Design a protein around this ligand. Sequence first.
Ligand SMILES: Nc1ncnc2c1ncn2[C@@H]1O[C@H](COP(=O)(O)O[C@H]2[C@@H](O)[C@H](n3cnc4c(N)ncnc43)O[C@@H]2COP(=O)(O)O[C@H]2[C@@H](O)[C@H](n3cnc4c(N)ncnc43)O[C@@H]2COP(=O)(O)O[C@H]2[C@@H](O)[C@H](n3cnc4c(N)ncnc43)O[C@@H]2COP(=O)(O)O)[C@@H](O)[C@H]1O
Ligand SMILES: Nc1ncnc2c1ncn2[C@@H]1O[C@H](COP(=O)(O)O[C@H]2[C@@H](O)[C@H](n3cnc4c(N)ncnc43)O[C@@H]2COP(=O)(O)O[C@H]2[C@@H](O)[C@H](n3cnc4c(N)ncnc43)O[C@@H]2COP(=O)(O)O[C@H]2[C@@H](O)[C@H](n3cnc4c(N)ncnc43)O[C@@H]2COP(=O)(O)O)[C@@H](O)[C@H]1O
Ligand SMILES: [Cl-]
Ligand SMILES: [Cl-]
Ligand SMILES: [Cl-]
Lengths: 271, 271, 271, 241, 247, 241
Amino acid sequence: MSSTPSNQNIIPIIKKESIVSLFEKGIRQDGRKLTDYRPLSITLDYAKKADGSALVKLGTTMVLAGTKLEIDKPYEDTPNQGNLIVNVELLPLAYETFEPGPPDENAIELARVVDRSLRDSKALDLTKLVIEPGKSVWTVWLDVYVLDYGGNVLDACTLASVAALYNTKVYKVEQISVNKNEVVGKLPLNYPVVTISVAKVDKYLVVDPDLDEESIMDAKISFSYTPDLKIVGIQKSGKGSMSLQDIDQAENTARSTAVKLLEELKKHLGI
Amino acid sequence: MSSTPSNQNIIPIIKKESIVSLFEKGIRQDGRKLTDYRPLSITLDYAKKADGSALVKLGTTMVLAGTKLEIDKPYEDTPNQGNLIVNVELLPLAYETFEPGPPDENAIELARVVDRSLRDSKALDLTKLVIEPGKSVWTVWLDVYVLDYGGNVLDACTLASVAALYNTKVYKVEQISVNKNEVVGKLPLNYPVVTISVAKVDKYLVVDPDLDEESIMDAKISFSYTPDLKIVGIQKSGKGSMSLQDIDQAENTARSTAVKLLEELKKHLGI
Amino acid sequence: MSSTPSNQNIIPIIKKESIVSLFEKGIRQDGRKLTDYRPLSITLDYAKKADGSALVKLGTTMVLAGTKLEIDKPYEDTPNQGNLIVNVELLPLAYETFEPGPPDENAIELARVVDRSLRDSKALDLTKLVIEPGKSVWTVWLDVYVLDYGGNVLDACTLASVAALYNTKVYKVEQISVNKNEVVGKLPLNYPVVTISVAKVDKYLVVDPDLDEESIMDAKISFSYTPDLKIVGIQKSGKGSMSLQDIDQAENTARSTAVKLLEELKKHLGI
Amino acid sequence: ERPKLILDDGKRTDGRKPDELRSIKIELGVLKNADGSAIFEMGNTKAIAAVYGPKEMHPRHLSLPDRAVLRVRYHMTPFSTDERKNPAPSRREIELSKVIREALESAVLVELFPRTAIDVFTEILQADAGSRLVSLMAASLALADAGIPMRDLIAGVAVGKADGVIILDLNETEDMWGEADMPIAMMPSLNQVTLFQLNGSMTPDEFRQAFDLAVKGINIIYNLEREALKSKYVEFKEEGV
Amino acid sequence: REMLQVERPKLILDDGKRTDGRKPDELRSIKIELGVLKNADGSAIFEMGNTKAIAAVYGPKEMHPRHLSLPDRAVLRVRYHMTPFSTDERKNPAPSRREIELSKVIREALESAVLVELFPRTAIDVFTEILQADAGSRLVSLMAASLALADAGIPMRDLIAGVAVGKADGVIILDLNETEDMWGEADMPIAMMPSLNQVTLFQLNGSMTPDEFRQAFDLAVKGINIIYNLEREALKSKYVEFKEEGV
Amino acid sequence: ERPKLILDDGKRTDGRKPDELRSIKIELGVLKNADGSAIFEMGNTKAIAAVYGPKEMHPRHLSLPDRAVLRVRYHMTPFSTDERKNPAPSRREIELSKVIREALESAVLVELFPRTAIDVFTEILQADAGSRLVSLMAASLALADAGIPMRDLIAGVAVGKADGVIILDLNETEDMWGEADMPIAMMPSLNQVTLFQLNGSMTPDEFRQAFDLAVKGINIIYNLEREALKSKYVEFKEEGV
Ligand SMILES: Nc1ncnc2c1ncn2[C@@H]1O[C@H](COP(=O)(O)O[C@H]2[C@@H](O)[C@H](n3cnc4c(N)ncnc43)O[C@@H]2COP(=O)(O)O[C@H]2[C@@H](O)[C@H](n3cnc4c(N)ncnc43)O[C@@H]2COP(=O)(O)O[C@H]2[C@@H](O)[C@H](n3cnc4c(N)ncnc43)O[C@@H]2COP(=O)(O)O)[C@@H](O)[C@H]1O
Ligand SMILES: Nc1ncnc2c1ncn2[C@@H]1O[C@H](COP(=O)(O)O[C@H]2[C@@H](O)[C@H](n3cnc4c(N)ncnc43)O[C@@H]2COP(=O)(O)O[C@H]2[C@@H](O)[C@H](n3cnc4c(N)ncnc43)O[C@@H]2COP(=O)(O)O[C@H]2[C@@H](O)[C@H](n3cnc4c(N)ncnc43)O[C@@H]2COP(=O)(O)O)[C@@H](O)[C@H]1O
Ligand SMILES: [Cl-]
Ligand SMILES: [Cl-]
Ligand SMILES: [Cl-]
């Protein structure tokens, strides 16, 4: 059963206006324009014992994503596909008020949202992960851990995920057994994917909301893009609502940002 | 661990005597005699995506039971039988003081009680659900959902269950796969079964207690009957106790009511 | 997640000095010396439906351990070994501050500690439990139930366990099926093992702390010994700390006690 | 194999044109014990919602000082689908519950009832795609039936892309094989989007087209909701937008 | 229609006698002892034949979760549980549906005896463990509890006594076997406050004609009364042993 | 074949002498949102700890009247090991959390903060034996970073017996195949043992030898901890005690 969060911070009336009055001048607290992204750092192969890993810092948000490959019989439903299991965890260490031990509501929501934009975009080609058709396929465990909650966690997960996958090493397949030091190649990835979150605060729209900005927003909406700018996932979020034209502009903005972010993601990954 | 329900409505001393004073004149609040049943409605094949379904209204109580058939290897213990898995659920739509999330003390008890009177009566012949002996049998999932708590839920479950089963459609068995639009026949049912609950309030016995009547009763006792009037299950229930002669009469009454109820159930089912 | 026990019996400042003032004279409340063990009773084959069982009374502590043998495929990891499974039940029955529901961090700790001193000591030879190598082995379920919490539960579990195993009857193996009334022999046991717990209270060290003594101790440390006095497991326990020389003497004491306890355990088991 | 989603004549698998709603059936106050109840049916998707009106909270500290706490539950009965859905809640079921709760939080005037919890319980009796929207609307009406004041009623459709054709109100089949499935919910009078999700693929254009169509659908539904409120019972044979 | 014979074993054998050599109206060997656990406020071990249960009681105390208490009553917390080595094949420790239902049935049974009004805001813990199961485990458990409560000095209306009564090979029999529970037509646990002639627990699984029901019922009482006397005795002398005997 | 641990001039599998520590790397205040944070690395075991400073308890009755309640969690990320560790906590993970909590309870001055909970969260990012000690030390430093007053910092090593040779700071490999694995943690300034465990087999003598060696190791580590406190960042290339 889902219920209104009692614990998430009720940020005073006064503080909200301060931020809005700045928005009115097209600037924010940290200094960036309404459509700007926070500084982005990506450190690849961070967790050494992962198959592929990525440490992402988007502003003060920190996410560590790591992959782990396993050989399984494919699901009886989908006999010609490898499996993908995305797993967001919101470990308390992220924020001043969290519960630990395997994920809750938002952790699950984050995972499914990241899942759907990897799967539905065929950014990762699951049909290319088949070893013995119907008998054995690769299972790609994606485990995404949020270490520091800086706001706009979704976008940072998408990034950490895409990065971890691109970092992933496939191994030699001894015919029966895996061999974990003869590296065969890389994951069958068609292209990277970015998720861009736009927050509606008051009457303004804001790209990549920070912690404060999130706590005062009416709602946020997230758009997943493939490199050629096909929309590949959308998620409205938050207890407030949003007008029709709000959403229209939101996507407009989300998209012309997507280009910039995608280039920068590629630079971290190496084209 | 089991513990005294705290949640429940402690119904005042005064209200009880109002009801008892009426019982003394052989009448109840709703108008019926001490041995009468509430009005009964049964709508068959209610949930369309079930194999068989039944919506039962006994007074203000509402139960929707639905069957779902599956092919399984039979229990290693019982290699010549199909399986019956009952599941009663007290969803919180039922009543004010109700539990969300998978079934509790009361619910489990309801399921097992319903189970035992179907299984021990051989009302449903499990030996007649074998496809390949020892290799594959039918598993009959009965799922009983209580939507409106009007009191005396047990009897309405028995009814909704028996009805759902009689509504159940068996399918063609392609030898390996099920074919869900060539209907082969019906479930191997020997006869219907009814459960009659008698509540001891004060010194009186009352058939089919309603919500008020349940909250003031000392205890209730439930009798399951096959059409031939063989007792096929008994369950005492409630915080209080009951004398020897109380039980004697309870069964006497329960039985000469069973006949009437059975005749009415059959009308809904078409004999 | 692990947290400081809130139901933890905060035994007053005053009561502590009564006990310490006695320790200063080298005596305790019950009368025994600082290095003495509480009276020990063992009743073998107590639970009749167990393969082997032992009821142990160490002071007012009661533990009932029972074994149950099963035939399983060995773990793909360890293909030439029978399996050992120690479960532990701090039965709510034992103390007034004991929640029910499958093992808590305390009950698990006891199990793993008992496990490690049976397994790492090769007191029970797991390689000697193989039926058909790689295909089928014996799984030894050890289930230890604490019935009365008299303090120093760990030692009494070690004892109950060792006793239960020595009481264990192996059965005839019909080649496919077990035959539970042709007794083939006994468990492949190399030797018994004892665990001795030494509690640091104030500046004193105390062997086999009772309930009061446990509630006032800084910490306790437990040593597992094989018959010719090889240390085979160590566990520090408690919210407080212990000096280097404390530990040194602790083990010294633990060991010259181990001899006496082992001789007494053997008497109960019969040579 | 893949079934063809738009047949040679321009009609879908159930014989609807790209712009036609499925048969809608609504009724209120169907449960005695709930404070408010509603059954909603779009085509073969059948949901029932019960509301338990503003009451204080059993766990004291979990309440809210100025707000009602919404407690929402989306759940699929084991016999709502072609193969027995497991009763124990799935990740899908959990996400949906949140998405729905949030949706309702934007409509319900939760400030009016501090320290109080409002329970909204939802059961899918038959799933045929857009189960989450039928659920949400059932809830919205059950809340209205409960006399709980909201900003507006909530109305919604799944809109999608079939064989490159943008279509209104999806099938089980259409959800399964089409390029895109995009549930949208509104407070239509306020022109406010309450729930918005897309899974699948769309060009910004297609996105905006499907969006325009979703509105036209929502408006027709919203009128039936108004009607259901007045007369307690509404039926609607399928019609073009 | 050749040389065909039934696979289910005969339950009423030579003379009146059952599989364990008892006549239809004979109780299994009973053994009771109180105050066996140091740390409990009240304790009891009860044995009927090979069914052997232990019950511990934790006397009237306030509730850790404040709002879960009752304003005028004690809250009974009861637990029926089977140790993994109580049966012929390892019973799983984690509680079964059977175990859950039985806990409720037993709790309710006790709620009718214990004077819970005397202790508002307080919880009374009753913990029960089956050490060997041989049918009627729930009754051995309930009685163990009743006595453990009495041992705890908690005032009740009466002690609770109970037997499983059943139908074997069409013969009505008293106090069932593991074997008789399985193969017989009917198994009917019944518990009483015998002095008050009050039924506390009542269940039937299986099949019976109203007549058979009433016969079995009469027999159950006769059994219960003999047991009830041993309970009284166990209270006074803390220890009771009873070699099997006909009603 | 059981691998050979001590080779033909007594160096170990990673080329260390019996008395050499693995490479240590410490850094504090690495997390923005925590009240105190630390990353600790010994060889290939890396842990991260976050602390959430003294705050009141959400469940009122669970607090302590004169003490802070320590809430500790040891957890291994699914990609910390050679084969995906399951995220849901194991029995091993549970015991360790307790063993660690108790360890910390002897250092932290919990009396100073009645009614308050201090949260200590720990994550193993790579496991290479002695994960529990790296975890504990990370915690100890994260607590210190949080400005929470303790009696002393906690330092620890796993000491063991390899091919009958007593060795300091164990490998993944050495933990596996060696006769003994004995984690030991200290408040070195107070000469106080905080955590102490042995799994495996040892003669009282060997026990006492390993013990002496563990101290010498702990002291070197303790110095780096002091250093990490002052300069917020410490690196240490392996060498002999
Ligand atoms: N349960 C159920 N029964 C019957 N009909 C059902 C239904 N759920 C939906 N429907 C039908 O669909 C409509 C409309 O709803 P929706 O828009 O969501 O449409 C669904 C539906 O068409 C189809 N689908 C998914 N699961 C189905 C089942 N069981 N039965 C029938 N159809 C099913 O996919 C659409 C999108 O689903 P979702 O939003 O959940 O996204 C999924 C999906 O893309 C994929 N996934 C997961 N499980 C799948 C199965 N069984 N089949 C196909 N695809 C499946 O992963 C996404 C999220 O999965 P998640 O649960 O978060 O994580 C799982 C998953 O990654 C993996 N797992 C498990 N089983 C599988 C299979 N078979 N294949 C791939 N991966 C799998 O394990 C992860 C860990 O979870 P754990 O298992 O440990 O709990 C409704 O009205 C109705 O008509
Ligand atoms: N999870 C994990 N993956 C990979 N590497 C891991 C790791 N955890 C640690 N490490 C690596 O080892 C070093 C140092 O570790 P440690 O100091 O703990 O030394 C351990 C470790 O080396 C090894 N071990 C334990 N688990 C391991 C896994 N998964 N992989 C590799 N090695 C593993 O055993 C040493 C001592 O272990 P412990 O004190 O925990 O006692 C265990 C152990 O001896 C044995 N056991 C349990 N699980 C085992 C696996 N997977 N493989 C081999 N042996 C394993 O049983 C003892 C008791 O376990 P417990 O959980 O209390 O109870 C279980 C057990 O009785 C039985 N069970 C379940 N599965 C198995 C297997 N596979 N084999 C035997 N018995 C088994 O069932 C009981 C009931 O619980 P249920 O399983 O039903 O949940 C780290 O730093 C890192 O580098
Ligand atoms: Cl849907
Ligand atoms: Cl029983
Ligand atoms: Cl470790």
